[PDB]
Design a protein around this ligand. Structure first.
Ligand SMILES: O=C(Nc1ccc2c(c1)-c1ccccc1S2(=O)=O)N1CCC(F)(F)CC1
Ligand SMILES: O=C(Nc1ccc2c(c1)-c1ccccc1S2(=O)=O)N1CCC(F)(F)CC1
Lengths: 546, 546
């Protein structure tokens, strides 16, 4: 029985195959059939190509050797190469045109999810071309999803040499009958088969996947849309910045490009952005996913005043100061969304662009205090329950697993009454002791929040709600201002704390405001609709944020 | 007696003054004298400009109000503004042309060095222009060098209102007689003087500095070339990446732009790059200063094999994998320099560009083992002393302060014989118990290395020398290759371990190699000649590394 799946790169995990471009060039240039392909494999195991694939020479050293082989091949066929013939130009284009074979990757991802050990086994070169980065990016995106990457130029061995197959077997710690091997070259498939491995000749993807699913007994074709790539906390780059003597800010960092600062809500973590971090980094951005003040590995001072908007925003500016960032795109959800609008109002020079998920921008009423404005419009009754220090902390910290299981639920899973909290005397009074697991989270993901919240508890997080009067007074200084930097407002149809209708007047204060809307989405936007969030954010970032 | 220096921004710390461009535009456009300047201050404390400087409105909201004032002013003077007149265009240009007043900053830096509390007090706006980043960058570079930055638009107060002066005094925790205040506007100087502060009207910088030095009794003018900005370890962003179960890599991170990975030598730290980190980040790069495996906050496994080049390079690739970086510019010194040439040979797709300080690239001799090649060319006798596990560790760890004080010395400070180590039986036998402090280091900088080396000691660092045969065998696989990506070789005239002559044949293996040379520079390149290093690296990075 199979427990390992091995995939080739060219013609298998990446399409169109770079090899097949030699034939395309022959047809386009009206050269004799197989001429370029013959010059490519000239000398067989002793030839320039084998030396390149073994890593004896780099791609740039190989280019003139292929050109020499091309001349010798044309000479025998009694023909001539065109005036502007360039091997570099042909391969630059072929490599650049080659993209991931998404359904093949999805199949590999499903097999690994079902307990398979996956590997990429490829005949490749040491790319030292001025344009090598495009390929470096392709390999990076691909490799992360597999247990192993065996490259011919790294191991000094090549397909179809039997050595590489024995090396693959040993890397896999598996006997050949436990291995399914997928390749587009029949010759490279032969030694794996001769060893006893299940082999698949890959021409079209669909047939190869039908063969793969028949042989593994796992559904891989026509299967539902998978969730975006998530984050394994121990495989992340963890950053720590001291913003003042008693305050340190923790963040997770992934990618290169314009800095994108992700700001979570209550009672969350940097981990609430797990489905956005890999997607945003893949889209060409440097993601900085925060543990906001009071949370996870960030400092949680006890004082209420340490959590007013003025202090939080000032510390985020200091955070940018110490990291050497003149700007960052600020993306917030919930209380993070509120922080991001205030960063745009008070520090526009430090905010490249501003985006909020669910949290609208509503200017302060200079006549009514928010301690009295609650309750007026809807019922923010739970906010009144959050005011008295120690009360909500006691209920929220009693059983952490129950707290996150009860709170982190989709719109059609509510076990919590949004309001009547200060009548019933608690958020969890009509809730079970052992809540069911929401379809949005695994048991493992709940236990990450449990472990995170064991360090500082709910005092710091609840203190974000305890500066109503302080925040209002500070917000009143910004009343004559408008947000004129690029801005995105993303509403969630079924968020009952933050109803889309609350955002309707925003264009009066942010005239050039751009929008997004997610249907059948509750309060926990990022984990409820990750695919939609990523497409709305990536589209807006590529259009409005460098 | 003075203990605090306060500087204005426009016309004082930054030149040319943005205010003086209104007059320049009047002259260029042949408009009535003072017209634009009058429209700018129209309404005095009730006018658009005061509201802007108090932070009631943003710069973009102000632009059309200034345009309206410009029309009203021209109407009274019975004149007309030109067809293509644009306030935004005028200010965009004025702000962009404004640069730091370097000698004024150097004076502020010298005063802070001599125990002064320094501050910037400025009348500024909330910049929400599409080009706001240029100003954000200016403020970032400037602010880091001062204890305080008081901005009118942040404090809701403006110069010359007496409130701001009382606010400044309170921020400073100082009585007005202890304060020297520098400004280009006589009116804004008046309330500070009326309070009892020493005031300086700044027209030309030189006179202002003569006045400043006479009043402080500190030499500020004609003073020597200062050292580049260094790093305070506690004000840095510290990053941690787990590359494998037992290995975590620590790094310091500063800046935005192309990733520049700094790799130290033996027995060093990320801190060996203290003078390069702020300079390189200022030059438009994202600096990642490593604690190499075996050092500081990075893991130090005991096994010798954990330190062979193959493993170290593979882990640096994994480091890039986990941070989401397809490439980084690799800059190494000493053993770090050796690592960087091997990264370029084995992983060219992951190396944007390669630079080495002192360490040359010399291909392996496939006939002679390096355990026998030592000694042949010079005398690498100390390397033989480093071989036996536990011996060099005992001497190097006995007294840490003595170790770093003895090793970290300029060319004309040697208390150490480079060789005859394995005859005399130790690196420190003819060295004092209490070495003098080298002119290259302060006592505080030595104590940072002491504290760093208290965690893991010298086992891991010395293990870099204990894989001679392993490294040679791996290097022999690269013998047919050439380094064809952008490369820089920087030689140090007085490095006696790495003599410039050792690098002479490099062009045979790196044909397009670029060079740098530092005269009167010993082995500790970065701290010996920081200014020269920064100019050679910045020049090469801007030319060859995106
Ligand atoms: O209080 C919030 N959100 C918010 C976040 C998390 C939870 C609730 C509300 C809530 C409300 C009622 C019961 C349980 C819970 S809960 O613990 O699941 N907001 C006010 C400030 C803001 F506008 F910035 C963002 C929205
Ligand atoms: O050993 C080195 N450098 C090096 C680094 C640090 C010290 C010495 C040598 C040395 C030599 C003799 C006495 C004291 C000392 S010391 O402890 O001050 N190199 C060989 C490998 C390389 F080529 F990669 C870089 C250069």
């Amino acid at each position: 029985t199979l427990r390992a799946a091995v995939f080739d790169l060219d013609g298998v995990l990446a399409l169109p195959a770079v090899f097949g471009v030699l034939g395309r060039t022959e047809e386009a240039l009206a050269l004799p059939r197989g001429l370029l392909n013959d010059a490519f494999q000239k000398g067989g195991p002793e030839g320039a190509t084998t030396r390149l694939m073994k890593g004896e020479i780099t791609l740039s050293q190989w280019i003139p050797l292929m050109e020499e082989n091309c001349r010798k091949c044309s000479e025998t066929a009694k023909v001539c190469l065109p005036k502007n013939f360039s091997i570099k130009e042909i391969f630059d284009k072929a490599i650049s045109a080659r993209k991931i074979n998404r359904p093949m990757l999805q199949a590999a991802l499903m097999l690994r999810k079902k307990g398979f050990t996956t590997a990429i086994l490829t005949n490749t070169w040491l790319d030292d071309r001025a344009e090598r980065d495009g390929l470096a990016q392709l390999m990076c995106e691909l490799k992360m999803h597999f247990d192993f990457l065996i490259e011919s130029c790294q191991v000094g061995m090549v397909k179809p040499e039997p050595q590489i197959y024995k090396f693959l077997l040993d890397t896999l710690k598996a006997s050949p009958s436990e291995v399914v091997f997928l390749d587009d070259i029949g010759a490279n498939l032969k030694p794996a088969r001769d060893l006893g491995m299940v082999t698949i000749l890959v021409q079209d993807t669909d047939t190869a996947l039908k063969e793969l699913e028949k042989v593994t007994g796992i559904q891989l074709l026509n299967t539902p849309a998978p969730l975006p790539t998530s984050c394994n906390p121990s495989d992340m780059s963890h950053g720590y910045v001291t913003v003042k003597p008693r305050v340190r800010l923790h963040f997770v960092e992934l990618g290169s490009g314009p800095a994108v600062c992700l700001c979570h809500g209550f009672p969350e973590s940097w981990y609430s952005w797990r489905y956005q971090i890999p997607a945003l980094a893949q889209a060409g951005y440097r993601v900085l996913a925060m543990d906001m003040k009071g949370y996870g590995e960030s400092s949680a001072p006890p004082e209420i005043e340490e959590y007013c908007m003025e202090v939080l925003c000032k510390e985020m500016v200091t955070f940018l100061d110490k990291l050497g960032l003149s700007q960052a795109v600020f993306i917030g959800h919930d209380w993070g969304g509120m922080l991001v609008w205030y960063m745009a109002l008070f520090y526009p020079e430090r905010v490249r662009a501003v985006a909020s998920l669910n949290t609208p921008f509503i200017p302060a009423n200079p006549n009514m205090s928010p301690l009295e404005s609650i309750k007026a419009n809807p019922v923010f009754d739970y906010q009144l329950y959050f005011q008295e220090p120690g009360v909500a902390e006691a209920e929220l910290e009693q059983n952490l697993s129950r707290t996150f299981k009860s709170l982190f639920r989709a719109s059609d899973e509510s076990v919590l009454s949004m309001h009547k909290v200060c009548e019933a005397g608690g958020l969890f009074v009509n809730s079970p002791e052992e809540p069911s697991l929401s379809r949005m989270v695994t048991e493992e993901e709940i236990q990450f929040y449990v472990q995170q919240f064991k360090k500082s508890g709910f005092r710091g997080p609840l203190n974000w709600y305890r500066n109503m009067e302080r925040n209002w007074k500070w917000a009143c200084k910004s009343l004559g201002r408008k947000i004129l930097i690029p801005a995105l407002m993303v509403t969630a149809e079924k968020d009952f704390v933050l109803v889309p209708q609350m955002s309707q007047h925003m264009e009066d204060w942010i005239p050039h405001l751009k929008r997004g809307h997610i249907e059948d989405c509750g309060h926990w936007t990022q984990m409820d609709k990750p695919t939609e969030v990523n497409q709305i954010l990536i589209k807006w970032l590529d259009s409005d944020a460098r």
